[PDB]
Amino acid sequence: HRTAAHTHIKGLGLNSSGIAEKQAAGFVGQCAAREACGVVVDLIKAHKMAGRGVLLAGGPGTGKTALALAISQELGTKIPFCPITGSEIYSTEVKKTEVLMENFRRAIGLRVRETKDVYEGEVTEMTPEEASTLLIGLKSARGQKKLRLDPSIYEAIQKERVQVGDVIYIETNTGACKRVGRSDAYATEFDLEAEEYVPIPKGEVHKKKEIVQDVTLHDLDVANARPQGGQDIISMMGQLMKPKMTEITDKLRMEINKVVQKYINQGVAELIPGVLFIDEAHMLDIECFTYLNKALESPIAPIVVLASNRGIATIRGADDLKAAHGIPPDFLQRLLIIPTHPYEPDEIRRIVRIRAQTEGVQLTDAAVDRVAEHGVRISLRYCLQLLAPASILARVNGRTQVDVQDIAEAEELFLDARRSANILTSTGESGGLHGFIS
Protein backbone atom coordinates (compact mmCIF):
# COMPACT_ATOMS: atom_id res chain seq x y z
CA HIS A 1 0.00 0.00 0.00
CA ARG A 2 0.93 3.67 -0.38
CA THR A 3 2.63 5.73 2.35
CA ALA A 4 1.37 9.24 3.12
CA ALA A 5 2.56 11.63 5.84
CA HIS A 6 0.53 10.19 8.76
CA THR A 7 0.16 6.52 7.77
CA HIS A 8 2.31 5.42 10.73
CA ILE A 9 -0.23 6.93 13.17
CA LYS A 10 -2.59 4.11 14.19
CA GLY A 11 -4.21 5.78 17.20
CA LEU A 12 -3.49 7.79 20.30
CA GLY A 13 -1.55 5.03 22.09
CA LEU A 14 -3.37 5.44 25.42
CA ASN A 15 -3.48 3.08 28.38
CA SER A 16 -6.78 1.72 29.70
CA SER A 17 -6.63 4.54 32.29
CA GLY A 18 -6.33 6.96 29.35
CA ILE A 19 -2.72 7.84 30.21
CA ALA A 20 -0.44 8.06 27.17
CA GLU A 21 2.34 5.56 26.58
CA LYS A 22 5.60 7.40 25.90
CA GLN A 23 5.84 5.65 22.52
CA ALA A 24 2.87 3.72 21.14
CA ALA A 25 0.54 3.42 18.15
CA GLY A 26 3.17 5.30 16.12
CA PHE A 27 3.38 8.35 18.37
CA VAL A 28 6.40 9.62 20.24
CA GLY A 29 5.84 12.12 23.03
CA GLN A 30 3.00 14.66 23.04
CA CYS A 31 1.71 12.69 26.03
CA ALA A 32 -0.23 15.64 27.48
CA ALA A 33 -1.86 16.39 24.10
CA ARG A 34 -2.63 12.71 23.48
CA GLU A 35 -4.26 12.36 26.91
CA ALA A 36 -6.38 15.46 26.22
CA CYS A 37 -7.34 14.00 22.82
CA GLY A 38 -8.28 10.79 24.64
CA VAL A 39 -10.83 12.73 26.70
CA VAL A 40 -12.13 14.28 23.47
CA VAL A 41 -12.57 10.73 22.11
CA ASP A 42 -14.65 9.89 25.20
CA LEU A 43 -16.67 13.07 24.65
CA ILE A 44 -17.46 11.88 21.11
CA LYS A 45 -18.26 8.24 21.94
CA ALA A 46 -20.49 9.33 24.85
CA HIS A 47 -23.19 10.54 22.45
CA LYS A 48 -24.94 12.99 24.78
CA MET A 49 -23.16 16.35 24.16
CA ALA A 50 -23.75 18.73 21.25
CA GLY A 51 -21.50 21.47 19.92
CA ARG A 52 -18.46 21.31 22.20
CA GLY A 53 -15.49 23.09 20.59
CA VAL A 54 -11.84 22.03 20.78
CA LEU A 55 -8.65 23.81 19.68
CA LEU A 56 -5.32 22.22 18.84
CA ALA A 57 -2.64 24.90 19.06
CA GLY A 58 1.11 24.84 18.47
CA GLY A 59 3.89 25.35 15.99
CA PRO A 60 3.98 23.87 12.50
CA GLY A 61 5.21 20.29 12.54
CA THR A 62 4.33 19.67 16.20
CA GLY A 63 1.81 16.98 15.28
CA LYS A 64 -1.57 18.72 15.42
CA THR A 65 -2.75 16.85 12.32
CA ALA A 66 -1.30 13.57 13.57
CA LEU A 67 -3.47 14.08 16.67
CA ALA A 68 -6.64 14.88 14.70
CA LEU A 69 -6.11 11.78 12.54
CA ALA A 70 -5.34 9.67 15.63
CA ILE A 71 -8.70 10.78 17.05
CA SER A 72 -10.32 9.73 13.75
CA GLN A 73 -8.92 6.20 14.25
CA GLU A 74 -9.64 5.74 17.95
CA LEU A 75 -13.15 6.83 16.86
CA GLY A 76 -13.29 4.01 14.29
CA THR A 77 -15.08 3.92 10.94
CA LYS A 78 -18.62 3.99 12.38
CA ILE A 79 -18.54 7.60 13.59
CA PRO A 80 -18.37 10.38 10.95
CA PHE A 81 -15.05 12.21 10.86
CA CYS A 82 -15.33 15.18 8.48
CA PRO A 83 -11.97 16.91 7.81
CA ILE A 84 -11.74 20.29 6.11
CA THR A 85 -9.35 23.19 6.00
CA GLY A 86 -10.71 26.63 6.84
CA SER A 87 -9.64 27.60 3.31
CA GLU A 88 -12.35 25.34 1.83
CA ILE A 89 -15.24 27.47 3.19
CA TYR A 90 -14.93 30.08 0.39
CA SER A 91 -17.34 28.63 -2.15
CA THR A 92 -18.29 30.71 -5.18
CA GLU A 93 -21.64 28.93 -5.25
CA VAL A 94 -23.26 29.56 -1.82
CA LYS A 95 -22.57 31.86 1.13
CA LYS A 96 -19.85 30.80 3.58
CA THR A 97 -22.31 30.02 6.38
CA GLU A 98 -24.09 27.44 4.23
CA VAL A 99 -20.74 25.74 3.53
CA LEU A 100 -20.10 25.55 7.29
CA MET A 101 -23.67 24.38 7.93
CA GLU A 102 -23.40 21.59 5.35
CA ASN A 103 -20.14 20.40 6.95
CA PHE A 104 -21.77 20.46 10.38
CA ARG A 105 -24.38 18.05 9.02
CA ARG A 106 -21.85 15.86 7.20
CA ALA A 107 -20.43 15.21 10.68
CA ILE A 108 -23.72 13.76 12.01
CA GLY A 109 -24.41 10.21 10.91
CA LEU A 110 -27.49 8.03 10.72
CA ARG A 111 -27.13 4.26 10.58
CA VAL A 112 -29.77 1.90 9.16
CA ARG A 113 -29.73 -1.89 8.91
CA GLU A 114 -31.41 -3.42 5.86
CA THR A 115 -32.08 -7.07 5.18
CA LYS A 116 -31.43 -6.98 1.42
CA ASP A 117 -33.61 -9.56 -0.38
CA VAL A 118 -31.77 -10.18 -3.66
CA TYR A 119 -33.04 -12.32 -6.55
CA GLU A 120 -30.79 -12.97 -9.55
CA GLY A 121 -31.66 -15.35 -12.36
CA GLU A 122 -32.61 -16.03 -15.95
CA VAL A 123 -36.18 -14.90 -16.68
CA THR A 124 -38.30 -18.00 -17.33
CA GLU A 125 -41.79 -16.44 -17.29
CA MET A 126 -43.45 -12.98 -17.42
CA THR A 127 -47.20 -13.60 -16.98
CA PRO A 128 -49.84 -10.97 -16.12
CA GLU A 129 -52.13 -11.92 -13.21
CA GLU A 130 -54.28 -8.80 -12.73
CA ALA A 131 -56.73 -6.56 -14.60
CA SER A 132 -50.50 -4.54 -13.37
CA THR A 133 -49.34 -7.51 -11.30
CA LEU A 134 -47.11 -10.10 -12.95
CA LEU A 135 -45.65 -13.40 -12.02
CA ILE A 136 -41.97 -13.41 -12.98
CA GLY A 137 -40.17 -16.75 -13.06
CA LEU A 138 -36.46 -16.70 -12.29
CA LYS A 139 -33.99 -19.52 -12.85
CA SER A 140 -30.47 -20.26 -11.69
CA ALA A 141 -28.24 -23.32 -11.99
CA ARG A 142 -29.67 -24.39 -8.59
CA GLY A 143 -33.42 -24.02 -9.15
CA GLN A 144 -36.36 -21.81 -10.01
CA LYS A 145 -38.54 -19.37 -8.09
CA LYS A 146 -41.67 -17.38 -8.99
CA LEU A 147 -42.30 -13.84 -7.75
CA ARG A 148 -45.58 -11.96 -7.55
CA LEU A 149 -44.70 -8.43 -8.70
CA ASP A 150 -46.14 -5.17 -7.45
CA PRO A 151 -47.45 -3.20 -10.48
CA SER A 152 -44.75 -0.54 -9.94
CA ILE A 153 -41.70 -2.80 -9.75
CA TYR A 154 -43.14 -4.48 -12.84
CA GLU A 155 -42.94 -1.13 -14.65
CA ALA A 156 -39.36 -0.79 -13.36
CA ILE A 157 -38.65 -4.23 -14.87
CA GLN A 158 -40.45 -3.05 -18.02
CA LYS A 159 -38.33 0.11 -18.30
CA GLU A 160 -35.31 -2.09 -18.14
CA ARG A 161 -35.74 -3.87 -21.46
CA VAL A 162 -36.28 -7.24 -19.77
CA GLN A 163 -37.59 -10.24 -21.72
CA VAL A 164 -37.76 -14.00 -21.25
CA GLY A 165 -34.25 -15.44 -21.40
CA ASP A 166 -32.64 -12.29 -20.01
CA VAL A 167 -30.67 -12.45 -16.78
CA ILE A 168 -31.87 -9.89 -14.24
CA TYR A 169 -31.02 -8.72 -10.75
CA ILE A 170 -33.80 -7.62 -8.36
CA GLU A 171 -33.62 -6.02 -4.93
CA THR A 172 -37.11 -7.10 -3.89
CA ASN A 173 -37.05 -5.03 -0.68
CA THR A 174 -35.78 -1.77 -2.22
CA GLY A 175 -37.53 -2.21 -5.57
CA ALA A 176 -34.38 -1.80 -7.67
CA CYS A 177 -33.74 -4.02 -10.66
CA LYS A 178 -31.12 -4.39 -13.39
CA ARG A 179 -30.87 -6.24 -16.70
CA VAL A 180 -27.55 -8.10 -16.39
CA GLY A 181 -27.74 -9.44 -19.94
CA ARG A 182 -29.21 -12.22 -22.02
CA SER A 183 -28.45 -15.77 -20.92
CA ASP A 184 -25.88 -17.43 -23.17
CA ALA A 185 -28.13 -20.48 -23.60
CA TYR A 186 -29.67 -18.09 -26.17
CA ALA A 187 -26.28 -17.09 -27.62
CA THR A 188 -27.10 -18.89 -30.91
CA GLU A 189 -30.57 -17.41 -31.46
CA PHE A 190 -28.75 -15.76 -34.38
CA ASP A 191 -25.17 -15.80 -35.53
CA LEU A 192 -24.89 -12.04 -35.04
CA GLU A 193 -27.01 -9.93 -32.77
CA ALA A 194 -26.14 -6.72 -30.92
CA GLU A 195 -26.58 -8.41 -27.55
CA GLU A 196 -24.55 -9.09 -24.38
CA TYR A 197 -24.74 -12.83 -23.61
CA VAL A 198 -23.87 -13.81 -20.02
CA PRO A 199 -23.82 -17.21 -18.25
CA ILE A 200 -26.78 -18.20 -16.09
CA PRO A 201 -26.14 -17.46 -12.38
CA LYS A 202 -24.41 -20.46 -10.81
CA GLY A 203 -25.47 -19.70 -7.22
CA GLU A 204 -28.81 -19.70 -5.42
CA VAL A 205 -31.48 -17.70 -7.24
CA HIS A 206 -32.32 -15.93 -3.95
CA LYS A 207 -29.86 -14.37 -1.49
CA LYS A 208 -30.55 -12.66 1.86
CA LYS A 209 -27.88 -10.26 3.18
CA GLU A 210 -27.57 -8.11 6.32
CA ILE A 211 -26.18 -4.69 5.30
CA VAL A 212 -25.49 -1.87 7.76
CA GLN A 213 -26.07 1.32 5.73
CA ASP A 214 -24.74 4.77 6.70
CA VAL A 215 -26.04 8.18 5.62
CA THR A 216 -25.59 11.69 7.01
CA LEU A 217 -28.05 14.46 7.76
CA HIS A 218 -26.49 16.32 4.83
CA ASP A 219 -27.39 13.47 2.47
CA LEU A 220 -30.95 14.01 3.70
CA ASP A 221 -30.64 17.77 3.11
CA VAL A 222 -29.51 17.20 -0.48
CA ALA A 223 -32.12 14.53 -1.20
CA ASN A 224 -34.98 16.69 0.12
CA ALA A 225 -33.89 19.99 -1.45
CA ARG A 226 -33.89 18.94 -5.12
CA PRO A 227 -34.68 15.96 -7.38
CA GLN A 228 -31.53 13.86 -7.55
CA GLY A 229 -29.85 11.54 -10.04
CA GLY A 230 -32.07 9.77 -12.56
CA GLN A 231 -34.99 11.95 -11.50
CA ASP A 232 -33.26 15.09 -12.78
CA ILE A 233 -32.61 14.17 -16.41
CA ILE A 234 -32.79 17.77 -17.71
CA SER A 235 -29.73 18.52 -15.53
CA MET A 236 -27.67 17.17 -18.45
CA MET A 237 -28.15 20.53 -20.23
CA GLY A 238 -25.96 22.38 -17.70
CA GLN A 239 -26.23 26.18 -17.41
CA LEU A 240 -29.33 26.90 -15.25
CA MET A 241 -30.09 23.16 -14.96
CA LYS A 242 -26.87 22.27 -13.09
CA PRO A 243 -27.40 20.76 -9.61
CA LYS A 244 -26.09 23.89 -7.91
CA MET A 245 -25.74 24.06 -4.16
CA THR A 246 -28.44 26.33 -2.74
CA GLU A 247 -28.80 28.24 0.54
CA ILE A 248 -30.88 25.57 2.27
CA THR A 249 -33.41 27.06 4.69
CA ASP A 250 -33.73 26.20 8.38
CA LYS A 251 -37.33 25.13 7.66
CA LEU A 252 -35.94 22.22 5.60
CA ARG A 253 -33.36 21.20 8.22
CA MET A 254 -36.14 21.39 10.84
CA GLU A 255 -38.36 19.00 8.82
CA ILE A 256 -35.37 16.66 8.40
CA ASN A 257 -34.93 16.59 12.18
CA LYS A 258 -38.62 15.77 12.63
CA VAL A 259 -38.70 13.00 9.99
CA VAL A 260 -35.40 11.50 11.19
CA GLN A 261 -36.60 11.47 14.81
CA LYS A 262 -39.66 9.46 13.71
CA TYR A 263 -37.42 6.69 12.33
CA ILE A 264 -35.30 6.79 15.48
CA ASN A 265 -38.41 6.32 17.65
CA GLN A 266 -39.39 3.32 15.50
CA GLY A 267 -35.85 1.93 15.97
CA VAL A 268 -35.28 1.83 12.21
CA ALA A 269 -32.41 4.35 12.40
CA GLU A 270 -29.52 4.87 14.84
CA LEU A 271 -28.10 8.37 15.34
CA ILE A 272 -24.30 8.77 15.36
CA PRO A 273 -22.95 12.27 16.17
CA GLY A 274 -19.42 12.76 14.88
CA VAL A 275 -16.54 15.23 14.45
CA LEU A 276 -16.02 18.20 12.18
CA PHE A 277 -12.27 18.90 11.96
CA ILE A 278 -11.26 22.34 10.65
CA ASP A 279 -7.53 22.44 9.98
CA GLU A 280 -5.88 25.79 9.19
CA ALA A 281 -8.63 27.40 11.27
CA HIS A 282 -6.83 30.77 11.12
CA MET A 283 -8.08 30.89 7.50
CA LEU A 284 -11.65 31.28 8.76
CA ASP A 285 -12.74 34.90 8.75
CA ILE A 286 -14.60 36.93 11.38
CA GLU A 287 -17.97 36.22 9.73
CA CYS A 288 -17.36 32.46 9.89
CA PHE A 289 -16.51 32.58 13.62
CA THR A 290 -19.63 34.69 14.22
CA TYR A 291 -21.77 31.99 12.59
CA LEU A 292 -19.98 29.24 14.53
CA ASN A 293 -21.23 30.94 17.70
CA LYS A 294 -24.83 30.35 16.61
CA ALA A 295 -24.16 27.00 14.91
CA LEU A 296 -22.60 25.51 18.07
CA GLU A 297 -25.72 26.49 20.07
CA SER A 298 -28.14 24.19 18.21
CA PRO A 299 -29.02 21.00 20.15
CA ILE A 300 -27.93 18.88 17.21
CA ALA A 301 -24.36 19.85 16.30
CA PRO A 302 -21.11 17.86 16.03
CA ILE A 303 -18.06 18.25 18.19
CA VAL A 304 -15.77 20.69 16.34
CA VAL A 305 -11.96 20.37 16.42
CA LEU A 306 -9.99 23.40 15.23
CA ALA A 307 -6.25 23.48 14.57
CA SER A 308 -4.11 26.62 14.43
CA ASN A 309 -0.39 27.37 14.22
CA ARG A 310 -0.58 31.20 14.37
CA GLY A 311 0.78 33.30 17.19
CA ILE A 312 -0.79 36.71 17.77
CA ALA A 313 -2.22 37.43 14.33
CA THR A 314 -4.81 39.59 12.61
CA ILE A 315 -8.31 38.18 12.27
CA ARG A 316 -9.16 37.82 8.59
CA GLY A 317 -11.87 40.23 7.48
CA ALA A 318 -11.28 42.40 10.59
CA ASP A 319 -7.85 43.98 10.10
CA ASP A 320 -8.13 46.13 13.26
CA LEU A 321 -8.32 43.02 15.49
CA LYS A 322 -5.31 40.91 16.48
CA ALA A 323 -5.57 37.90 18.77
CA ALA A 324 -3.77 34.69 19.69
CA HIS A 325 -4.14 31.77 17.25
CA GLY A 326 -5.79 34.15 14.83
CA ILE A 327 -9.00 33.19 16.65
CA PRO A 328 -11.14 36.12 17.83
CA PRO A 329 -11.15 36.22 21.64
CA ASP A 330 -14.94 36.19 21.67
CA PHE A 331 -14.86 32.72 20.08
CA LEU A 332 -11.81 31.48 22.03
CA GLN A 333 -13.80 31.41 25.29
CA ARG A 334 -15.92 28.52 23.95
CA LEU A 335 -12.98 26.21 23.21
CA LEU A 336 -11.16 23.51 25.10
CA ILE A 337 -7.53 24.22 24.14
CA ILE A 338 -4.78 21.59 23.79
CA PRO A 339 -1.18 22.87 23.35
CA THR A 340 1.28 20.86 21.23
CA HIS A 341 4.99 21.42 22.11
CA PRO A 342 8.17 21.15 19.99
CA TYR A 343 10.07 17.87 19.81
CA GLU A 344 13.51 17.19 21.32
CA PRO A 345 16.49 15.55 19.54
CA ASP A 346 15.91 12.05 20.94
CA GLU A 347 12.19 12.25 20.14
CA ILE A 348 13.16 13.16 16.57
CA ARG A 349 15.45 10.11 16.36
CA ARG A 350 12.49 7.96 17.42
CA ILE A 351 10.10 9.51 14.86
CA VAL A 352 12.76 9.01 12.16
CA ARG A 353 12.98 5.27 12.90
CA ILE A 354 9.17 4.94 12.90
CA ARG A 355 8.91 6.70 9.52
CA ALA A 356 11.77 4.69 7.99
CA GLN A 357 10.23 1.31 8.84
CA THR A 358 6.84 2.59 7.65
CA GLU A 359 8.26 3.58 4.25
CA GLY A 360 10.17 0.28 4.15
CA VAL A 361 13.52 2.10 4.21
CA GLN A 362 16.31 0.26 6.01
CA LEU A 363 18.91 2.50 7.67
CA THR A 364 22.28 2.21 9.28
CA ASP A 365 22.27 3.79 12.74
CA ALA A 366 24.79 6.36 11.47
CA ALA A 367 22.24 7.23 8.77
CA VAL A 368 19.61 7.53 11.52
CA ASP A 369 21.82 9.89 13.52
CA ARG A 370 22.73 11.99 10.47
CA VAL A 371 19.08 12.28 9.38
CA ALA A 372 18.04 13.21 12.92
CA GLU A 373 20.63 16.02 12.99
CA HIS A 374 18.70 17.66 10.13
CA GLY A 375 15.53 17.58 12.25
CA VAL A 376 17.20 19.32 15.14
CA ARG A 377 19.00 21.88 12.99
CA ILE A 378 16.52 22.40 10.13
CA SER A 379 13.13 20.71 10.55
CA LEU A 380 11.58 17.38 11.49
CA ARG A 381 9.49 17.64 8.32
CA TYR A 382 12.75 17.93 6.35
CA CYS A 383 14.22 14.75 7.93
CA LEU A 384 11.36 12.59 6.76
CA GLN A 385 11.40 13.83 3.16
CA LEU A 386 15.05 12.77 2.76
CA LEU A 387 14.40 9.08 3.51
CA ALA A 388 12.69 8.17 0.22
CA PRO A 389 15.32 9.80 -2.07
CA ALA A 390 18.16 8.23 -0.07
CA SER A 391 16.52 4.82 -0.50
CA ILE A 392 16.49 5.28 -4.30
CA LEU A 393 20.09 6.51 -4.29
CA ALA A 394 21.20 3.53 -2.19
CA ARG A 395 19.66 0.95 -4.55
CA VAL A 396 21.12 2.51 -7.70
CA ASN A 397 24.39 2.59 -5.75
CA GLY A 398 23.70 -1.15 -5.33
CA ARG A 399 23.37 -1.06 -1.53
CA THR A 400 20.85 -3.14 0.40
CA GLN A 401 20.31 -0.43 3.04
CA VAL A 402 20.56 3.35 3.24
CA ASP A 403 23.88 4.61 4.61
CA VAL A 404 25.57 7.95 5.34
CA GLN A 405 26.70 8.40 1.71
CA ASP A 406 23.12 8.11 0.44
CA ILE A 407 21.88 10.59 3.06
CA ALA A 408 24.70 13.01 2.20
CA GLU A 409 23.87 12.80 -1.51
CA ALA A 410 20.15 13.29 -0.81
CA GLU A 411 21.00 16.43 1.22
CA GLU A 412 22.82 17.89 -1.79
CA LEU A 413 20.22 17.00 -4.42
CA PHE A 414 17.30 18.19 -2.27
CA LEU A 415 17.68 21.50 -0.41
CA ASP A 416 15.64 22.79 2.49
CA ALA A 417 14.00 26.22 2.43
CA ARG A 418 16.76 27.73 4.60
CA ARG A 419 19.69 26.85 2.31
CA SER A 420 17.63 27.82 -0.74
CA ALA A 421 16.83 31.13 0.97
CA ASN A 422 20.60 31.71 1.27
CA ILE A 423 20.88 31.12 -2.49
CA LEU A 424 18.06 33.58 -3.16
CA THR A 425 19.78 36.12 -0.89
CA SER A 426 23.17 35.75 -2.63
CA THR A 427 21.76 35.82 -6.18
CA GLY A 428 18.79 38.23 -6.19
CA GLU A 429 21.35 41.03 -6.12
CA SER A 430 20.33 42.84 -9.31
CA GLY A 431 17.78 43.34 -12.07
CA GLY A 432 20.42 41.77 -14.29
CA LEU A 433 20.41 38.70 -16.47
CA HIS A 434 20.82 35.97 -13.82
CA GLY A 435 18.92 37.45 -10.86
CA PHE A 436 15.86 36.00 -9.21
CA ILE A 437 12.82 38.25 -9.63
CA SER A 438 12.08 40.04 -6.35
Partner: protein, 120 residues
Protein backbone atom coordinates in the same frame (compact mmCIF):
# COMPACT_ATOMS: atom_id res chain seq x y z
CA UNK B 1 -14.95 4.10 -20.68
CA UNK B 2 -14.58 0.61 -19.20
CA UNK B 3 -17.85 -1.10 -18.32
CA UNK B 4 -16.57 -1.36 -14.73
CA UNK B 5 -17.07 2.40 -14.48
CA UNK B 6 -19.90 3.07 -16.93
CA UNK B 7 -22.01 -0.02 -16.18
CA UNK B 8 -20.91 -2.18 -13.22
CA UNK B 9 -21.24 0.17 -10.28
CA UNK B 10 -18.67 2.84 -10.97
CA UNK B 11 -21.80 4.98 -11.20
CA UNK B 12 -23.06 5.71 -7.70
CA UNK B 13 -26.76 6.19 -8.47
CA UNK B 14 -27.37 3.00 -10.49
CA UNK B 15 -28.18 -0.13 -8.43
CA UNK B 16 -26.94 -3.60 -9.25
CA UNK B 17 -24.55 -6.32 -8.11
CA UNK B 18 -21.49 -4.49 -6.87
CA UNK B 19 -23.49 -1.37 -5.99
CA UNK B 20 -25.42 -2.43 -2.88
CA UNK B 21 -25.65 1.16 -1.55
CA UNK B 22 -27.64 2.71 -4.40
CA UNK B 23 -30.89 0.74 -4.14
CA UNK B 24 -31.13 1.31 -0.40
CA UNK B 25 -30.25 4.99 -0.66
CA UNK B 26 -32.76 5.51 -3.49
CA UNK B 27 -35.66 4.12 -1.43
CA UNK B 28 -34.80 5.70 1.92
CA UNK B 29 -33.76 9.17 0.79
CA UNK B 30 -36.57 9.61 -1.77
CA UNK B 31 -39.45 7.83 0.03
CA UNK B 32 -38.94 6.66 3.63
CA UNK B 33 -36.94 9.59 5.08
CA UNK B 34 -38.33 12.04 2.53
CA UNK B 35 -40.19 15.11 3.79
CA UNK B 36 -42.39 15.51 0.71
CA UNK B 37 -44.00 12.07 0.79
CA UNK B 38 -47.73 12.43 1.66
CA UNK B 39 -47.44 10.39 4.88
CA UNK B 40 -44.71 12.74 6.14
CA UNK B 41 -46.46 15.93 4.95
CA UNK B 42 -49.71 14.85 6.64
CA UNK B 43 -47.86 14.87 9.99
CA UNK B 44 -46.86 18.55 9.60
CA UNK B 45 -50.02 20.02 8.13
CA UNK B 46 -51.29 21.95 11.14
CA UNK B 47 -50.53 24.69 13.66
CA UNK B 48 -47.15 26.31 13.05
CA UNK B 49 -45.66 23.12 11.58
CA UNK B 50 -43.74 23.32 8.34
CA UNK B 51 -46.51 22.37 5.86
CA UNK B 52 -49.23 24.49 7.51
CA UNK B 53 -49.36 26.71 4.39
CA UNK B 54 -50.18 23.78 2.06
CA UNK B 55 -53.90 24.16 2.90
CA UNK B 56 -53.99 27.46 0.99
CA UNK B 57 -51.61 27.18 -1.99
CA UNK B 58 -54.08 25.39 -4.32
CA UNK B 59 -52.08 22.12 -4.42
CA UNK B 60 -52.82 18.63 -3.10
CA UNK B 61 -50.44 16.55 -1.01
CA UNK B 62 -50.10 14.41 -4.14
CA UNK B 63 -49.22 17.48 -6.21
CA UNK B 64 -46.72 18.77 -3.65
CA UNK B 65 -45.16 15.29 -3.71
CA UNK B 66 -44.98 15.21 -7.53
CA UNK B 67 -43.49 18.73 -7.79
CA UNK B 68 -40.74 17.80 -5.31
CA UNK B 69 -39.71 14.66 -7.23
CA UNK B 70 -40.12 15.45 -10.94
CA UNK B 71 -37.64 17.74 -12.68
CA UNK B 72 -38.46 21.18 -14.08
CA UNK B 73 -39.06 19.83 -17.59
CA UNK B 74 -41.53 17.17 -16.41
CA UNK B 75 -43.20 19.77 -14.16
CA UNK B 76 -43.44 22.17 -17.12
CA UNK B 77 -45.29 19.50 -19.11
CA UNK B 78 -47.67 18.90 -16.19
CA UNK B 79 -48.17 22.69 -16.09
CA UNK B 80 -49.43 22.56 -19.70
CA UNK B 81 -52.45 20.51 -18.54
CA UNK B 82 -53.73 23.29 -16.24
CA UNK B 83 -56.05 26.29 -16.40
CA UNK B 84 -55.78 29.94 -15.29
CA UNK B 85 -59.10 29.70 -13.42
CA UNK B 86 -58.07 32.17 -10.69
CA UNK B 87 -57.60 34.68 -13.49
CA UNK B 88 -61.08 33.87 -14.80
CA UNK B 89 -62.50 34.51 -11.31
CA UNK B 90 -61.14 38.05 -11.60
CA UNK B 91 -63.42 38.53 -14.63
CA UNK B 92 -66.51 37.01 -12.98
CA UNK B 93 -66.34 37.62 -9.21
CA UNK B 94 -66.16 41.32 -9.67
CA UNK B 95 -69.01 43.19 -7.99
CA UNK B 96 -68.80 44.31 -4.34
CA UNK B 97 -71.30 41.56 -3.48
CA UNK B 98 -68.92 39.01 -5.03
CA UNK B 99 -66.54 40.12 -2.22
CA UNK B 100 -63.54 39.16 -4.42
CA UNK B 101 -64.41 35.51 -3.86
CA UNK B 102 -61.49 33.06 -3.93
CA UNK B 103 -61.47 29.32 -3.14
CA UNK B 104 -60.22 29.15 0.43
CA UNK B 105 -57.92 26.29 -0.57
CA UNK B 106 -56.37 28.82 -3.03
CA UNK B 107 -56.28 31.75 -0.55
CA UNK B 108 -52.50 32.39 -0.78
CA UNK B 109 -52.45 32.46 -4.61
CA UNK B 110 -52.84 36.23 -4.34
CA UNK B 111 -50.73 37.42 -7.29
CA UNK B 112 -52.57 35.24 -9.82
CA UNK B 113 -56.06 35.78 -8.37
CA UNK B 114 -55.47 39.51 -8.94
CA UNK B 115 -53.31 41.01 -11.68
CA UNK B 116 -54.00 43.46 -14.54
CA UNK B 117 -53.19 41.07 -17.42
CA UNK B 118 -56.39 38.99 -17.29
CA UNK B 119 -58.61 42.09 -17.39
CA UNK B 120 -56.68 43.56 -20.35
Amino acid sequence: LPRLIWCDGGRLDKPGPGNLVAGFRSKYLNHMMNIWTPENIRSSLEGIENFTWLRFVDTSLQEAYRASHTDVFARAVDLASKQNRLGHMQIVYDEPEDKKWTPVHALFQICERENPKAVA
